[PDB]
Amino acid sequence: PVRVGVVGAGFMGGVHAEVVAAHPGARLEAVHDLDPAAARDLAERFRAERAEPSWADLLADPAIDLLIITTPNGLHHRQAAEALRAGKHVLVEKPLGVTPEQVAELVELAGRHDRVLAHGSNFVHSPKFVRARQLVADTEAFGRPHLVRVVFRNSGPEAAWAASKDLAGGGALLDLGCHAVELCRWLLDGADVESVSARLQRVRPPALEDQALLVMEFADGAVGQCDVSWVTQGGEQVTAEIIGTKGRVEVDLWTGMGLRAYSDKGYQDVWDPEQGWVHPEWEWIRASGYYHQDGTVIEAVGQGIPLTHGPAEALASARVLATGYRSHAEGRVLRLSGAPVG
Amino acid sequence: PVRVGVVGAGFMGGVHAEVVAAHPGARLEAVHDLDPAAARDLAERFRAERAEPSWADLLADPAIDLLIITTPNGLHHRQAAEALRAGKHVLVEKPLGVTPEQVAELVELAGRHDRVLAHGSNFVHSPKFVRARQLVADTEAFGRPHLVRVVFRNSGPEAAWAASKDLAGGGALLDLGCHAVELCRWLLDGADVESVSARLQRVRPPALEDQALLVMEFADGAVGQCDVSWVTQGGEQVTAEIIGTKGRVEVDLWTGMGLRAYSDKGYQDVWDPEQGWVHPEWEWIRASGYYHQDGTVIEAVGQGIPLTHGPAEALASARVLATGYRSHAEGRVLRLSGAPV
Amino acid sequence: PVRVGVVGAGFMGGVHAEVVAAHPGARLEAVHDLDPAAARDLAERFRAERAEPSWADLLADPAIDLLIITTPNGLHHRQAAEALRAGKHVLVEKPLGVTPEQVAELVELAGRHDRVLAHGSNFVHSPKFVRARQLVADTEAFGRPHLVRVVFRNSGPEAAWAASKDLAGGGALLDLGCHAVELCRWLLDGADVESVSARLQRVRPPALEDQALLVMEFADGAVGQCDVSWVTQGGEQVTAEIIGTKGRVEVDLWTGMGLRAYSDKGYQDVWDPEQGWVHPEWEWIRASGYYHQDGTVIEAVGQGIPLTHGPAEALASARVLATGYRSHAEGRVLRLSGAPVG
Amino acid sequence: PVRVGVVGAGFMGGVHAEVVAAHPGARLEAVHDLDPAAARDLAERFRAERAEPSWADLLADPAIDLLIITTPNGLHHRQAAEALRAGKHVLVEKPLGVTPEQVAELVELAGRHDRVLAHGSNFVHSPKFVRARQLVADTEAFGRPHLVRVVFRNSGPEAAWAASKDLAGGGALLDLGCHAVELCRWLLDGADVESVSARLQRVRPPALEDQALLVMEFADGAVGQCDVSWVTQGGEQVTAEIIGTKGRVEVDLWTGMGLRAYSDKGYQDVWDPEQGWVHPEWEWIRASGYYHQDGTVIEAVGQGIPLTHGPAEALASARVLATGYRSHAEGRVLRLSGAPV
Ligand SMILES: NC(=O)C1=CN([C@@H]2O[C@H](COP(=O)(O)OP(=O)(O)OC[C@H]3O[C@@H](n4cnc5c(N)ncnc54)[C@H](O)[C@@H]3O)[C@@H](O)[C@H]2O)C=CC1
Ligand SMILES: NC(=O)C1=CN([C@@H]2O[C@H](COP(=O)(O)OP(=O)(O)OC[C@H]3O[C@@H](n4cnc5c(N)ncnc54)[C@H](O)[C@@H]3O)[C@@H](O)[C@H]2O)C=CC1
Ligand SMILES: NC(=O)C1=CN([C@@H]2O[C@H](COP(=O)(O)OP(=O)(O)OC[C@H]3O[C@@H](n4cnc5c(N)ncnc54)[C@H](O)[C@@H]3O)[C@@H](O)[C@H]2O)C=CC1
Numbered sequence A, C: 001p002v003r004v005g006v007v008g009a010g011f012m013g014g015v016h017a018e019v020v021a022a023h024p025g026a027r028l029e030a031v032h033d034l035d036p037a038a039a040r041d042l043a044e045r046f047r048a049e050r051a052e053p054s055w056a057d058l059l060a061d062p063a064i065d066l067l068i069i070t071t072p073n074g075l076h077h078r079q080a081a082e083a084l085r086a087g088k089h090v091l092v093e094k095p096l097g098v099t100p101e102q103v104a105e106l107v108e109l110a111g112r113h114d115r116v117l118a119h120g121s122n123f124v125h126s127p128k129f130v131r132a133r134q135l136v137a138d139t140e141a142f143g144r145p146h147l148v149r150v151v152f153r154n155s156g157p158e159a160a161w162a163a164s165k166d167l168a169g170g171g172a173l174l175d176l177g178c179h180a181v182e183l184c185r186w187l188l189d190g191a192d193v194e195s196v197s198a199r200l201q202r203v204r205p206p207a208l209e210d211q212a213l214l215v216m217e218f219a220d221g222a223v224g225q226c227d228v229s230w231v232t233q234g235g236e237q238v239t240a241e242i243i244g245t246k247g248r249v250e251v252d253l254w255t256g257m258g259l260r261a262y263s264d265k266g267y268q269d270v271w272d273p274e275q276g277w278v279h280p281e282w283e284w285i286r287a288s289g290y291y292h293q294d295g296t297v298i299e300a301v302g303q304g305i306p307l308t309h310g311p312a313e314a315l316a317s318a319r320v321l322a323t324g325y326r327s328h329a330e331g332r333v334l335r336l337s338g339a340p341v342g
Numbered sequence B, D: 001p002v003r004v005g006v007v008g009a010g011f012m013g014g015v016h017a018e019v020v021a022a023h024p025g026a027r028l029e030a031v032h033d034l035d036p037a038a039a040r041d042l043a044e045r046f047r048a049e050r051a052e053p054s055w056a057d058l059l060a061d062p063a064i065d066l067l068i069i070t071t072p073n074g075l076h077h078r079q080a081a082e083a084l085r086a087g088k089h090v091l092v093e094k095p096l097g098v099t100p101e102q103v104a105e106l107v108e109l110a111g112r113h114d115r116v117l118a119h120g121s122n123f124v125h126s127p128k129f130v131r132a133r134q135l136v137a138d139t140e141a142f143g144r145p146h147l148v149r150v151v152f153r154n155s156g157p158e159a160a161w162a163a164s165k166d167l168a169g170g171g172a173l174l175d176l177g178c179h180a181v182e183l184c185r186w187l188l189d190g191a192d193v194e195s196v197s198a199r200l201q202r203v204r205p206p207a208l209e210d211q212a213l214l215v216m217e218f219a220d221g222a223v224g225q226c227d228v229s230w231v232t233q234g235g236e237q238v239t240a241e242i243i244g245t246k247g248r249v250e251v252d253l254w255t256g257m258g259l260r261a262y263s264d265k266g267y268q269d270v271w272d273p274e275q276g277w278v279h280p281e282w283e284w285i286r287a288s289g290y291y292h293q294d295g296t297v298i299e300a301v302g303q304g305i306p307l308t309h310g311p312a313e314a315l316a317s318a319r320v321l322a323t324g325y326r327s328h329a330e331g332r333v334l335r336l337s338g339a340p341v
């Protein structure tokens, strides 16, 4: 029975605490936050064994097998390292690190300490994204993939820390692009990136990028687009399309739930937009891949089943983003090494 | 740990076998079919303790707690009765019985032997339908519901038994209408039916009805339509809509998965239509309510949690359909008692 | 050059005045209203030769060839009769009459006076509805039609006269059902109705019906549903579906324009709903059939081209509705004669 | 009454012949093709005064006011120049020329002979695109536009000339991108392009580009994407999206007609895909802007109303594409001048 600690009792600590509490092979043992009242509230809401106010004590406790780190991006590296050095398995929310060297250091650490290190690429475990991938891999029907495009857009993160470079490590390219890049590479069966090209925008007034376009060229000829935004009103969008020589596949997460509703006022449990025509969500957590993700991690820890989607995939995506940031700066298409293609 | 037997190893025996194998609080203990090879196929597919070729032996086995009956409609009554008499809890695929009196007999019989009896109204446990019901029940936004329409259409059941009245008990109204009626009533929080009106069609050549429209009037003023069909090409359709004084809600099961795909050939695990633009399914079983339904039944048996959706609801729907059949015959709007309005 | 008079300078007088002013084979000659200022305003907005304040003078004027009657339903019969007796051709907005006998009287009148009588069934001239009909008539692909359903729903007519039985002649079944019935019969190539069954509701508090369902059985075996409503919020809906032994055809007028837009505030030229996700309209008048309709009528008058969709179709639909009203009262399925089927 | 000659009696000569025949202020006077039988087919189809087998005779005929040029891209320049020199007004299908200098030469040449020169940017006259532009321009609701994306994809041009560089002048970027670029600029009210960046692909075997992505940066901060493809099965796609600080607008031409149909066979007048679920078209020609475009040109010629969308816009787009081609070669983001950013 895998004894789990949640580190950061905010929004994603809550999502993970829910899926942990529901999983028969695990126990929600502890919740820790710098804000001890936020840890207590979440420990209560999901019936955790306890609130643990001390990081040091949490790490020394031999009753904890796995920590889930849901703190602000810029803390991920230090927290995960300390955790792995203390002997704990770790699931870290994306971004696993804020630079490829941060990520590489964690992977090497996890290997040295013989620990499972997993990162929070949940969409890659979304049942509807899994399906879409089988369809593209059905060569008879789809043929050879030549385009993949993944779009993540919303009206921007609300938490104050996501506005500072030291706490967030980057703007929209890092926050949403990490996911878009992973989904492109993974929809094409782990395709190798040969070049990266990107351009960033600052749409909101005075500074982190709040919208970006990043494009990858892959070994086989295919081209991937990642189009991400913190400045799109009207409801979060997560879509993908893949186009091959013979077929097409389209995926829609938030307006492909098969529910529509209309009201003047606004429905009680309905997000944003509030009023008028909306697309209410059912089982958003599962549809988004969190149950399957966390389940994989609980199994990897509980019985050394290797992860299907490892942290090496986080290194590859970190390299892509870092190169995207450079491509924007230099206004050219770059190899992952940083060299210009020409 | 609830020990489960599946009776009828065809399409729905397969669906229930999968959800049973996946449920931690249960064990797929046996599979039985008149065709012992089909039972063995399925027992293997889902790692059942055994294939049980003998109905008698299956019923006497004190290791089974619950049977799930996925045989042709006309057998449901006898099989469920024998099962309850043998001390087993029972989940019966819809229709629970072929007439209200068959259903009432089983409920009473389950009472006598102190057994859980459940019926396979899966859509009422569909996470997306549960959500749609909360939105309708959100009075400030939805206002008062005044219309509900549920549409079930497909190109018709392929099995030969579903073409015979003796084995099927009825045509599309009984087959698909039972679901549509339960969803209308349940979307409106168990609304009381005041009248029923229906017309049936025979579209494909010489005979059971192929297509039907059934309309309920409810106590509060709302009207429910159930529009069902065995003669609709182009992919199964399961949709609902609810309209209130202030809102609307629309529910779409099979073309509201957020996946589209195109090919000339046809994709390996994609149903019907085969070719051209299709809407592939993800997690169809869960989306359709089977995991939550069976879960409820496993919990009712395992730890005496009462069912949220009991077999009395199958009685209410059976009465509705029976009155719909009579409405069609007499060409008039009837009370459940059978009297004309 | 067909010289046209518009009678009733309200909403539909405005729609018709627009299409008349645009048509090269016609001239918007006069506009008449009991409210002479409403006639003047419309005469100006569309450059009519004049505002004609006198009905009698309008009818005696030998310079007018065709009157378009866009007054309240309950005036249609008397106005159209007087017009035809005076020697004028007439297009009457639906409902052409409020009972089958009103309609029959007008048809007989039009024949006696050798005049074109047309009624305002515009959807039957909607280019997208025309297409849908060819697809159903493509027997190879569609097979034999066995179901047709037409849905008209909105939040109800705003004009005061539509709330009185004397001025409106009926509630939603008459107002919206007339159109739904015509589209069902016409989508199936003028199919003969054998039985009618209907039920009406009064949803709004205290009285005319504000929602209805009417079902027709046709000669060939097919069944038609007309589902109409004055109590559906969230935007007007006009849809149809047809299902055959081999095929299906679906038509959507107001959410099948291929435009979507989102705003918090509301866009300047956008209807209802105002805010949030909307489906703005482009060329709604043409998409709805009014240009083609009126064009047919202008040609029938201008050069005795017979109407493709005649007033006999209004008699057939009037009979259907009248029988629907009776079916509701008696709670049974009736033949057009009024007899019960049994 | 504007007397019109159509030059090139293939697919677009057919489209323009239909809108010309239907326009009251014009007459379809002649149709000319290298294939005199194709010219005659079309002259008959649309009741043209005559089939004119001779280019020279067509140009000398003082009865023609306007020629519409619907020949292969590489001929546009020579044909339009000869036509303007012969005193005729000219509407040239896109691309107006194959290089910015070809386009600039024609504009200047039209000026010299005091002639209307128009190019076939039809989507910019599409009633639905015109509407989408008003919504974006509605500042209180939309706020400031910061993204525009236009997508044009199909399974590729079938004619052999469109596979040759000499006859086509370029691959998918020139063919489909010209439209996508004009729509981005025009949706943002004639926005000034500050930079261009593009990458091209060759998807189908050995060669002109099959698929491309071109991205503009605009003066105000907004970014435009043009995503074009000859290698997309499953039906032509023409869509756009615009996103502002407060709103979004989405435009869909071919799957936003409000018609769906299913058959196994295929419906008589339905394009591609043939079978299964399709989106049949109604009034495609009007929806695509051809009636309004040609109307504008007929009015410009007939009664000296200036064009709303002039050939200078074809120069701006030609510069963009030429810089996109260079961007792809050099693998960097370029100013229109050709300089790197
Ligand atoms: N996969 C996905 O879809 C999503 C991932 N995320 C990621 O999840 C992570 C957390 O996101 P949320 O929206 O922020 O939560 P958040 O802002 O709601 O809360 C973070 C919590 O961490 C606590 N905290 C801050 N620093 C701490 C420290 N050094 N030690 C212990 N506790 C600390 C705060 O008091 C707060 O309770 C982020 O890294 C973000 O990238 C966020 C949303 C969705
Ligand atoms: N909830 C839902 O959505 C659906 C429910 N159903 C229902 O499920 C039930 C089974 O339908 P399907 O699985 O489609 O049928 P099926 O034809 O796929 O299989 C029925 C099986 O029962 C076997 N059988 C026949 N007589 C038997 C006997 N005396 N004892 C044991 N087995 C016998 C047959 O050999 C066959 O394998 C029906 O009552 C039907 O109404 C069917 C489809 C969908
Ligand atoms: N085909 C279609 O889609 C539609 C048809 N309609 C129909 O069009 C007709 C008119 O509808 P609108 O919404 O009402 O216009 P409305 O209410 O806006 O105006 C009617 C006009 O008639 C004038 N008027 C009333 N009685 C008159 C009389 N005896 N003589 C001269 N003028 C008179 C009024 O002052 C007013 O200006 C109705 O019959 C309705 O059924 C209405 C909307 C859409």
Ligand SMILES: NC(=O)C1=CN([C@@H]2O[C@H](COP(=O)(O)OP(=O)(O)OC[C@H]3O[C@@H](n4cnc5c(N)ncnc54)[C@H](O)[C@@H]3O)[C@@H](O)[C@H]2O)C=CC1
Pocket: D007, D008, D009, D010, D011, D012, D013, D032, D033, D034, D035, D038, D069, D070, D071, D072, D073, D075, D093, D094, D095, D120, D122, D159
């Ligand atoms: N606006 C739009 O949406 C579209 C525009 N186009 C454009 O329209 C133009 C024509 O394309 P399509 O009609 O698809 O071509 P097509 O291949 O259908 O026909 C072109 C015709 O020109 C004829 N021709 C060849 N050389 C000639 C000459 N020297 N003199 C006279 N005629 C000659 C050919 O025989 C052929 O009939 C192209 O410039 C293309 O870029 C094409 C498709 C869509």
Ligand SMILES: NC[C@H]1O[C@H](O[C@H]2[C@H](O)[C@@H](O[C@H]3O[C@H](CO)[C@@H](O)[C@H](O)[C@H]3O)[C@H](N)C[C@@H]2N)[C@H](O)[C@@H](O)[C@@H]1O
Pocket: A011, A154, A156, A157, A158, A175, A176, A179, A236, A271, A272, A288
């Ligand atoms: N206004 C709608 C929602 O906006 C925030 O939450 C969304 C999350 O932000 C969203 O995640 C995306 O957005 C976050 C902010 O950009 C990213 O840090 C994250 O990587 C991405 O998947 C989840 N998949 C869906 C959540 N509902 C907000 O935190 C929620 O409380 C709220 O329900």
Ligand SMILES: NC[C@H]1O[C@H](O[C@H]2[C@H](O)[C@@H](O[C@H]3O[C@H](CO)[C@@H](O)[C@H](O)[C@H]3O)[C@H](N)C[C@@H]2N)[C@H](O)[C@@H](O)[C@@H]1O
Pocket: C011, C154, C156, C157, C158, C175, C176, C179, C236, C271, C272, C288
């Ligand atoms: N709130 C949206 C609209 O509601 C009314 O107008 C609609 C009209 O009412 C609508 O017609 C339907 O509704 C009318 C009212 O029920 C019926 O009398 C008519 O037979 C039917 O086609 C038109 N086809 C489309 C019009 N936009 C209203 O008159 C308009 O000014 C307004 O644009």
